[PDB]
Write an enzyme that holds these catalytic residues in place. Sequence first.
Site, PDB file in Angstrom:
ATOM      1  CG  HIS B  41      -0.565   0.006   2.599  1.00  0.00           C
ATOM      2  ND1 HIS B  41      -1.001  -0.854   3.410  1.00  0.00           N
ATOM      3  CD2 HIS B  41       0.255   1.028   3.092  1.00  0.00           C
ATOM      4  CE1 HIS B  41      -0.491  -0.250   4.590  1.00  0.00           C
ATOM      5  NE2 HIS B  41       0.253   0.539   4.289  1.00  0.00           N
ATOM      6  N   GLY B 143       1.895   6.092   9.488  1.00  0.00           N
ATOM      7  CA  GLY B 143       3.277   6.324   9.376  1.00  0.00           C
ATOM      8  C   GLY B 143       4.224   5.150   9.924  1.00  0.00           C
ATOM      9  CB  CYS B 145       2.137   0.898   7.670  1.00  0.00           C
ATOM     10  SG  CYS B 145       0.576   0.541   8.119  1.00  0.00           S
TER      11      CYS B 145
HETATM   12  C1  LIG Z   1       0.027   1.967   9.131  1.00  0.00           C
HETATM   13  C2  LIG Z   1       0.119   3.057   8.344  1.00  0.00           C
HETATM   14  O1  LIG Z   1       1.209   3.740   8.323  1.00  0.00           O
HETATM   15  N1  LIG Z   1      -0.848   3.505   7.776  1.00  0.00           N
HETATM   16  C3  LIG Z   1      -0.775   4.478   6.668  1.00  0.00           C
HETATM   17  C4  LIG Z   1      -1.297   3.859   5.472  1.00  0.00           C
HETATM   18  N2  LIG Z   1      -2.688   3.328   5.306  1.00  0.00           N
HETATM   19  C5  LIG Z   1      -2.968   2.470   4.051  1.00  0.00           C
HETATM   20  C6  LIG Z   1      -4.009   1.870   4.372  1.00  0.00           C
HETATM   21  C7  LIG Z   1      -4.378   0.393   4.540  1.00  0.00           C
HETATM   22  C8  LIG Z   1      -5.748  -0.184   4.495  1.00  0.00           C
HETATM   23  C9  LIG Z   1      -6.526   0.890   4.797  1.00  0.00           C
HETATM   24  S1  LIG Z   1      -5.822   2.450   4.038  1.00  0.00           S
HETATM   25  C10 LIG Z   1      -2.760   2.451   6.529  1.00  0.00           C
HETATM   26  C11 LIG Z   1      -2.275   2.964   7.797  1.00  0.00           C
END
Ligand SMILES: *CC(=O)N1CCN(Cc2cccs2)CC1
Lengths: 304, 304
Positions: B41, B143, B145
């Site tokens: 993603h 941020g 992820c």
């Molecule tokens: C964990 C993190 O950084 N985020 C930001 C990006 N966001 C993308 C998505 C995935 C599934 C739904 S939106 C996830 C949370």
Amino acid sequence: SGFRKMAFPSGKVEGCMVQVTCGTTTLNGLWLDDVVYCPRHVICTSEDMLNPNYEDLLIRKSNHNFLVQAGNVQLRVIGHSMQNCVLKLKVDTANPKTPKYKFVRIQPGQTFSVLACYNGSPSGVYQCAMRPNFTIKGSFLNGSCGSVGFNIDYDCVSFCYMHHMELPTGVHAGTDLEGNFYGPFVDRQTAQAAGTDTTITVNVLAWLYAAVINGDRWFLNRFTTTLNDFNLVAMKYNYEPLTQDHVDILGPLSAQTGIAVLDMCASLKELLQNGMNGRTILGSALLEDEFTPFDVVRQCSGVT
Amino acid sequence: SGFRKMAFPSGKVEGCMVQVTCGTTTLNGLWLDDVVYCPRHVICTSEDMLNPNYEDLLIRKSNHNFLVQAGNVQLRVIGHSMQNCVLKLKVDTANPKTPKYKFVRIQPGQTFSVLACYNGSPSGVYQCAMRPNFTIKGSFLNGSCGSVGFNIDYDCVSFCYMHHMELPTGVHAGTDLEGNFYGPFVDRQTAQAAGTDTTITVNVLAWLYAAVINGDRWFLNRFTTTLNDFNLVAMKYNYEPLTQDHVDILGPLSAQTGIAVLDMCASLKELLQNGMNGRTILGSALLEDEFTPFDVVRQCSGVT
Ligand SMILES: *CC(=O)N1CCN(Cc2cccs2)CC1
Ligand SMILES: *CC(=O)N1CCN(Cc2cccs2)CC1
């Protein structure tokens, strides 16, 4: 979202841990620049610990008696001295992994991370607070002494704790890195009782703000209180008195949530008087007091 | 003595964290040898997240579109591929801090440490478990992820989790390092509900053994039970059924304490039926289920 008991990343401290052996006693030391810091009870036999005269015991020790090993590499000891309850072993090599650091003496209610170590080898990291009775509630086996407690601000490690001792009640006593014990404790195998383990009120309030921010809100109520009224309740429940300084420190969390500090005190008052009625807050069935207001802001803002 | 929720020391993983940016999306990546692993993603706009076709979105991306920074140093991307829900970015430089590692897919009830990171920079470390519903209860902001979960055996890091997502209930969903989600979750901004968050019975029993070892004993009783009798109680309280495999795994803690597993089950049965009556166990007012039997032995034995 989510709120967890979180330790600082430990790599900068991992790079500083060494093994110190004097005779047949092994514990941990902290290697910063060309000094290794360790508890002075490394020079003791279990016999000596009943009533040690550390200046007299240390006269029988030479530089070559202090075996300092950094992983599998021996360090050469070229001087030693005692500062309060720590030894400072001067070695001939500056630790190349020495981070930017400071030595700080923390106040009761401040939190820090512990890197629990055995034989100079890191085993685990967890979060602690300096209790109001100047103990900490740690996880320390024999051989863990010399493990340290620290905070990190970006790239600077502030070392605040070195582990020296266990009280019969299973709580922990140590020094700062100047070798001065927190509280009244002494590095001797004698009768040492902890005082009242009072609850750190400003930390509970911080954690209730953390709870609201992270969606737990059931305990919010229609009430307010005053500092003096709240403190009558704090006294009854062995909570630290709340001061205007504590109110001022909670200002950012107040501002972020729109919940006045004294309104959150009234929520805490009802929780103290009524209990949790079998409910939970941020996965806890009791009121958590080892997150500082700074901790809550940090974890809620993602500081690195 | 003392028993704490303890994470692995994080330095070996800290050495592997990088920032990955694709267009205006920044998250974390894991740099092992000459591959950077990150959630796929990273290629999405918030618009794309409603119903992304990742193969179609990825066609519009080139090696030079993936900005990979390790501290202040840029890495040169010389290939990219998608494996399930992760991207593998091949870089021209092997990470010199790559530890011995493995990729493992963990089972529900297994615990691991999370190094929460933002912009490739470690913020904190905490301990998690893979829940029976294949969520984890973490602490993850936007941020975070690409932050990973891991276990350490001496010098080998077993990476088991990469963070991808939050459910509306504030629990967390991720993949292993092959990019396969734990549970039924998908990397799309859609209706995803967690199933029953059942309690990990074998872990609660392990933690009760930890409690006895560390002096908390009030909940020990005169009773025993059977697996089938205990499981009637487990069912009522949304606990995982206890199996002979779980009994076998608790054998060392049984042996160390002299408390038969089924006698500890009878203590747990009474705690489930009667509650804690305002008492605590290892500083907890609820039954803790995120220590495995291996965790308890490790922390009780001081493994490094
Ligand atoms: C964990 C993190 O950084 N985020 C930001 C990006 N966001 C993308 C998505 C995935 C599934 C739904 S939106 C996830 C949370
Ligand atoms: C923390 C640790 O390693 N130990 C072993 C050494 N032991 C020395 C003593 C200090 C005061 C009483 S005995 C302390 C625990």
